[PDB]
Design a binder for this molecule. Sequence first.
Ligand SMILES: O=C(C[n+]1ccc2ccccc2c1)c1ccccc1
Ligand SMILES: [Cl-]
Length: 548
Amino acid sequence: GKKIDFLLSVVGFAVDLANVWRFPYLCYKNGGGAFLIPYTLFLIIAGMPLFYMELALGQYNREGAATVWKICPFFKGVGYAVILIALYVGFYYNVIIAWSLYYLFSSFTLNLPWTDCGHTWNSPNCTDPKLLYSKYKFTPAAEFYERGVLHLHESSGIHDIGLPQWQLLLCLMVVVIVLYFSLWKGVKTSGKVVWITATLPYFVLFVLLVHGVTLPGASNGINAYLHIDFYRLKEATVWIDAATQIFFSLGAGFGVLIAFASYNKFDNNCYRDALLTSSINCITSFVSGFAIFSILGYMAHEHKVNIEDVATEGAGLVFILYPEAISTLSGSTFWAVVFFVMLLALGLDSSMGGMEAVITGLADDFQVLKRHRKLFTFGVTFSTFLLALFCITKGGIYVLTLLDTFAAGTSILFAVLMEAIGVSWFYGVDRFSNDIQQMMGFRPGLYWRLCWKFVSPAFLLFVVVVSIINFKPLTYDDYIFPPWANWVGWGIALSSMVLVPIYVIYKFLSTQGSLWERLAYGITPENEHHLVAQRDIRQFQLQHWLAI
Ligand SMILES: O=C(C[n+]1ccc2ccccc2c1)c1ccccc1
Ligand SMILES: [Cl-]
């Protein structure tokens, strides 16, 4: 039974709410098949090596995101930046969980609310196929999502967001309460409910893939998926999206892996962990795009619109697609309950780790917070609840879009780039390899060291530069955000990107001694500062820098 338990642990570790909710609309937006060449390339080249590096860092140092930089004291700012990014994401992550819970509540009926026209939320333009370049939004399912759930029709833009929706308010309160009462005792929340939180996503994917293929218009969707538009690969938006999605789904750049692995057995094998997680992620993504495009090809056939106009490209694509596939199944109520229970469980499970990253990273930094976990968890959870309250208004989809685009984009890419720099170049890839050898019994191979030192930082810097210089103003499918919205988003990105130089400056000024002594204290591990008085700093020799 241990092998069954081991398989469940690995397979449930590999799946995340990002894979299920954020990949579909990123694949639809960037053409489908053309989105997986950058996706797989960046996976192989930067996602697997960096996942491995973060796992090994956390496991060896037994420290959270912030304090793990005792190995090079100038990068505690990088730690703080990743904690801030993880805090920012939860604001709207919990809002998606609230949407899932509202849909689950709506699903306990024999006449599902998203199948036909004529409800209190329907407009005069509602078009049911059964009875009877701009995106198509007059379908029963899209109108349900945008009028009976979001109540978006009561907003004009990000300048008139409105007041909180009380239904989503109650759902968000339930979600927040569950998260707190799951996080207030301790970190350990594995092996107790993962039997359903690990197998249900894959069962849902399997039934969706087997069914959608047998739909009237699925062939056209699969063709649009498998036809690769090589012109999209010269635009840099697909590359930016693929990089950000790799880091979103693998957990890198959020401080989640470091905090999670600080609890692993010292001898735990991180090589196999990275290999298995990345392989499962790649196969799952390539198989999930198939089902997405089969569903929306059938939607194109049924609604008689072009496959590039059937559905939104925003955060609600899954909530538009899953209902459409559900209504085509027999016993649609049972299937709706299964799908939305899966979504709710997966979202709660992943948001728990996202919040535990913040709690652990900041508690390992201050002992007062480590002795008072109940109050700290309350504070984190309540601040998240309010700043998400901002996202459940009438025009809260615009704020969720602004956050989704700016909270972890260039900011997360920069943070992970600085992590790779600080470890590989300053701490030493050779010392990092020695630590991995002491932990796991074998030294990392040449491919891993090359990716850690040269290849991954090079591509991360390329993507960061391109994202900064090739930046498209913000939109939601028909709506052009006012310029001050992009300025606000760039301020949000800089708010976490800038913690690095500020901490470097603070550390330099707070230290005592001469310039060279200050640099030596700044780039030397905290438990080797007594060598500085001996004027033996390895970073001050060319040999340390020419290593591989
Ligand atoms: O990234 C996450 C949750 N997450 C995603 C992917 C993972 C992969 C492996 C291990 C843990 C993981 C956790 C998050 C959630 C809410 C706020 C901020 C960050
Ligand atoms: Cl993904």
